[PDB]
Amino acid sequence: EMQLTPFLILLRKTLEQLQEKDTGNIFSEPVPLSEVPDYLDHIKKPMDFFTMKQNLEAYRYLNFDDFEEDFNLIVSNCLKYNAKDTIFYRAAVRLREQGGAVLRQARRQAEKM
Template sequence: MDELARAPRHGPHFNELRRFLNQIQNHKQAWTFLSPVNKDEVPDYYNVITSPMDLSAMEQRLGQDSYTAPKDLVANLTLIFSNCRPYNDATTVYAKCANKLEKYMWSLIKEIPEWFDLLEE
Protein backbone atom coordinates (compact mmCIF):
# COMPACT_ATOMS: atom_id res chain seq x y z
CA MET A 1 0.00 0.00 0.00
CA ASP A 2 2.89 2.38 0.73
CA GLU A 3 4.19 1.93 -2.80
CA LEU A 4 0.79 2.80 -4.20
CA ALA A 5 0.59 5.93 -2.04
CA ARG A 6 4.04 7.06 -3.21
CA ALA A 7 3.34 6.42 -6.89
CA PRO A 8 2.75 9.58 -8.91
CA ARG A 9 -0.89 10.20 -9.73
CA HIS A 10 -0.11 11.65 -13.14
CA GLY A 11 2.41 11.33 -15.93
CA PRO A 12 5.88 12.93 -15.84
CA HIS A 13 4.84 16.08 -17.73
CA PHE A 14 1.60 16.71 -15.84
CA ASN A 15 2.69 19.68 -13.71
CA GLU A 16 4.39 21.57 -16.52
CA LEU A 17 1.45 20.91 -18.86
CA ARG A 18 -1.01 22.05 -16.21
CA ARG A 19 0.95 25.27 -15.64
CA PHE A 20 1.12 25.88 -19.39
CA LEU A 21 -2.59 25.23 -19.91
CA ASN A 22 -3.47 27.48 -16.96
CA GLN A 23 -1.46 30.31 -18.48
CA ILE A 24 -3.37 29.88 -21.73
CA GLN A 25 -6.75 29.70 -19.95
CA ASN A 26 -6.00 32.84 -17.95
CA HIS A 27 -5.05 34.93 -20.99
CA LYS A 28 -7.57 37.69 -21.67
CA GLN A 29 -8.14 36.43 -25.24
CA ALA A 30 -9.01 32.86 -24.10
CA TRP A 31 -12.60 33.66 -23.08
CA THR A 32 -14.17 32.39 -26.29
CA PHE A 33 -12.31 29.06 -26.14
CA LEU A 34 -12.93 28.19 -22.48
CA SER A 35 -15.95 25.98 -23.17
CA PRO A 36 -17.46 24.13 -26.15
CA VAL A 37 -19.32 26.05 -28.83
CA ASN A 38 -23.00 26.15 -27.88
CA LYS A 39 -25.08 24.20 -30.43
CA ASP A 40 -28.14 26.36 -29.70
CA GLU A 41 -26.28 29.59 -30.41
CA VAL A 42 -24.31 28.29 -33.40
CA PRO A 43 -26.39 25.45 -34.88
CA ASP A 44 -24.22 24.66 -37.92
CA TYR A 45 -20.85 24.73 -36.13
CA TYR A 46 -20.66 20.97 -35.60
CA ASN A 47 -21.60 20.35 -39.25
CA VAL A 48 -18.63 22.44 -40.36
CA ILE A 49 -16.10 21.59 -37.64
CA THR A 50 -15.62 17.84 -37.41
CA SER A 51 -13.01 17.78 -34.61
CA PRO A 52 -14.16 20.34 -32.06
CA MET A 53 -11.85 21.25 -29.19
CA ASP A 54 -11.96 23.74 -26.33
CA LEU A 55 -9.93 24.52 -23.23
CA SER A 56 -12.31 22.77 -20.82
CA ALA A 57 -12.02 19.55 -22.85
CA MET A 58 -8.25 19.95 -22.76
CA GLU A 59 -8.31 20.41 -19.00
CA GLN A 60 -10.35 17.24 -18.68
CA ARG A 61 -7.97 15.32 -20.95
CA LEU A 62 -5.02 16.58 -18.94
CA GLY A 63 -6.62 15.31 -15.74
CA GLN A 64 -7.07 11.91 -17.38
CA ASP A 65 -3.40 11.85 -18.47
CA SER A 66 -4.33 11.87 -22.15
CA TYR A 67 -1.35 14.10 -22.93
CA THR A 68 1.83 12.04 -22.78
CA ALA A 69 4.06 14.84 -24.09
CA PRO A 70 3.91 18.62 -24.58
CA LYS A 71 3.43 18.15 -28.34
CA ASP A 72 0.08 16.43 -27.69
CA LEU A 73 -1.25 19.36 -25.70
CA VAL A 74 0.07 21.87 -28.24
CA ALA A 75 -1.59 19.87 -31.03
CA ASN A 76 -4.97 20.30 -29.33
CA LEU A 77 -4.36 24.01 -28.83
CA THR A 78 -3.51 24.45 -32.50
CA LEU A 79 -6.67 22.47 -33.32
CA ILE A 80 -8.69 25.11 -31.45
CA PHE A 81 -7.13 27.84 -33.58
CA SER A 82 -7.44 25.93 -36.85
CA ASN A 83 -11.12 25.26 -36.08
CA CYS A 84 -11.78 28.91 -35.37
CA ARG A 85 -10.29 30.46 -38.49
CA PRO A 86 -12.24 28.68 -41.24
CA TYR A 87 -15.52 29.09 -39.40
CA ASN A 88 -15.09 32.76 -38.49
CA ASP A 89 -14.16 35.60 -40.82
CA ALA A 90 -10.73 37.12 -40.12
CA THR A 91 -12.37 40.38 -39.03
CA THR A 92 -14.41 38.78 -36.23
CA VAL A 93 -13.50 39.03 -32.58
CA TYR A 94 -13.20 35.23 -32.49
CA ALA A 95 -10.55 35.05 -35.20
CA LYS A 96 -8.68 37.95 -33.61
CA CYS A 97 -8.74 36.18 -30.24
CA ALA A 98 -7.43 33.00 -31.90
CA ASN A 99 -4.56 34.90 -33.51
CA LYS A 100 -3.56 36.65 -30.30
CA LEU A 101 -3.86 33.53 -28.15
CA GLU A 102 -1.85 31.47 -30.63
CA LYS A 103 0.87 34.12 -30.67
CA TYR A 104 0.89 34.03 -26.86
CA MET A 105 1.11 30.22 -26.90
CA TRP A 106 4.21 30.32 -29.12
CA SER A 107 5.78 32.98 -26.91
CA LEU A 108 5.31 30.70 -23.89
CA ILE A 109 6.82 27.75 -25.75
CA LYS A 110 9.88 29.87 -26.60
CA GLU A 111 10.44 30.32 -22.85
CA ILE A 112 10.65 26.54 -22.21
CA PRO A 113 13.99 25.20 -23.48
CA GLU A 114 12.75 21.59 -23.34
CA TRP A 115 9.96 22.48 -25.78
CA PHE A 116 12.12 24.16 -28.45
CA ASP A 117 11.58 21.21 -30.80
CA LEU A 118 7.91 22.24 -31.01
CA LEU A 119 8.89 25.53 -32.62
CA GLU A 120 10.08 23.80 -35.78
CA GLU A 121 6.66 22.25 -36.48
Protein backbone atom coordinates in the same frame (compact mmCIF):
# COMPACT_ATOMS: atom_id res chain seq x y z
CA GLU B 1 11.69 8.69 -20.78
CA MET B 2 10.72 10.88 -17.83
CA GLN B 3 8.57 10.87 -14.70
CA LEU B 4 4.84 11.36 -15.20
CA THR B 5 4.12 13.62 -12.22
CA PRO B 6 6.42 16.60 -13.02
CA PHE B 7 5.37 16.55 -16.67
CA LEU B 8 1.69 16.78 -15.78
CA ILE B 9 2.46 19.58 -13.31
CA LEU B 10 4.15 21.43 -16.18
CA LEU B 11 1.22 20.89 -18.53
CA ARG B 12 -1.17 22.15 -15.83
CA LYS B 13 0.86 25.35 -15.41
CA THR B 14 1.14 25.75 -19.19
CA LEU B 15 -2.61 25.32 -19.67
CA GLU B 16 -3.21 28.00 -17.03
CA GLN B 17 -0.81 30.36 -18.85
CA LEU B 18 -2.59 29.80 -22.15
CA GLN B 19 -5.97 30.46 -20.55
CA GLU B 20 -4.57 33.74 -19.21
CA LYS B 21 -4.01 34.89 -22.82
CA ASP B 22 -7.70 34.28 -23.65
CA THR B 23 -8.84 37.32 -21.69
CA GLY B 24 -12.36 37.19 -23.08
CA ASN B 25 -12.69 33.53 -22.04
CA ILE B 26 -14.06 32.78 -25.49
CA PHE B 27 -12.09 29.50 -25.63
CA SER B 28 -12.73 28.40 -22.01
CA GLU B 29 -15.65 26.08 -22.78
CA PRO B 30 -16.94 24.21 -25.84
CA VAL B 31 -18.49 26.33 -28.58
CA PRO B 32 -22.20 26.23 -27.63
CA LEU B 33 -23.69 23.96 -30.29
CA SER B 34 -27.18 25.01 -29.17
CA GLU B 35 -26.27 28.55 -30.28
CA VAL B 36 -24.19 27.55 -33.33
CA PRO B 37 -26.20 24.73 -34.96
CA ASP B 38 -24.04 24.59 -38.11
CA TYR B 39 -20.73 24.42 -36.23
CA LEU B 40 -20.16 20.66 -36.50
CA ASP B 41 -20.82 20.88 -40.26
CA HIS B 42 -17.36 22.43 -40.75
CA ILE B 43 -15.46 21.56 -37.56
CA LYS B 44 -14.63 17.87 -37.37
CA LYS B 45 -13.05 18.05 -33.88
CA PRO B 46 -14.17 20.84 -31.53
CA MET B 47 -11.73 21.82 -28.78
CA ASP B 48 -11.55 24.19 -25.81
CA PHE B 49 -9.55 24.71 -22.64
CA PHE B 50 -12.02 22.89 -20.38
CA THR B 51 -11.86 19.81 -22.61
CA MET B 52 -8.06 20.09 -22.62
CA LYS B 53 -8.11 20.12 -18.82
CA GLN B 54 -10.21 16.96 -18.74
CA ASN B 55 -7.92 15.28 -21.29
CA LEU B 56 -4.84 16.29 -19.27
CA GLU B 57 -6.24 14.63 -16.14
CA ALA B 58 -7.37 11.61 -18.20
CA TYR B 59 -3.72 11.08 -19.25
CA ARG B 60 -4.46 11.82 -22.89
CA TYR B 61 -1.35 14.08 -23.01
CA LEU B 62 1.83 12.10 -22.46
CA ASN B 63 4.08 14.19 -24.70
CA PHE B 64 4.15 17.85 -25.50
CA ASP B 65 3.02 17.40 -29.11
CA ASP B 66 -0.35 15.95 -28.20
CA PHE B 67 -0.99 18.84 -25.82
CA GLU B 68 0.07 21.38 -28.44
CA GLU B 69 -2.04 19.63 -31.10
CA ASP B 70 -5.24 20.24 -29.13
CA PHE B 71 -4.26 23.86 -28.48
CA ASN B 72 -3.70 24.31 -32.20
CA LEU B 73 -7.20 22.92 -32.79
CA ILE B 74 -8.69 25.66 -30.58
CA VAL B 75 -7.00 28.24 -32.81
CA SER B 76 -7.53 26.59 -36.20
CA ASN B 77 -11.19 25.72 -35.60
CA CYS B 78 -11.89 29.37 -34.83
CA LEU B 79 -9.99 30.70 -37.86
CA LYS B 80 -11.88 28.24 -40.05
CA TYR B 81 -15.39 28.91 -38.75
CA ASN B 82 -15.29 32.72 -38.49
CA ALA B 83 -14.84 35.46 -41.06
CA LYS B 84 -11.63 37.48 -40.95
CA ASP B 85 -13.33 40.72 -39.90
CA THR B 86 -14.72 39.26 -36.67
CA ILE B 87 -13.56 39.54 -33.09
CA PHE B 88 -13.46 35.73 -32.89
CA TYR B 89 -11.08 35.42 -35.82
CA ARG B 90 -8.76 38.12 -34.49
CA ALA B 91 -8.84 36.58 -31.00
CA ALA B 92 -7.68 33.28 -32.46
CA VAL B 93 -4.82 35.03 -34.25
CA ARG B 94 -3.84 36.76 -31.03
CA LEU B 95 -4.04 33.48 -29.10
CA ARG B 96 -1.90 31.78 -31.74
CA GLU B 97 0.73 34.50 -31.34
CA GLN B 98 0.70 34.83 -27.56
CA GLY B 99 0.14 31.11 -26.97
CA GLY B 100 3.01 30.14 -29.25
CA ALA B 101 5.46 31.90 -26.93
CA VAL B 102 3.99 30.17 -23.87
CA LEU B 103 4.31 26.82 -25.61
CA ARG B 104 7.92 27.24 -26.73
CA GLN B 105 9.11 28.03 -23.21
CA ALA B 106 7.11 25.14 -21.75
CA ARG B 107 8.38 22.64 -24.31
CA ARG B 108 11.96 23.62 -23.48
CA GLN B 109 11.24 22.76 -19.85
CA ALA B 110 9.73 19.40 -20.83
CA GLU B 111 12.91 18.71 -22.81
CA LYS B 112 14.95 19.14 -19.62
CA MET B 113 12.99 16.25 -18.06
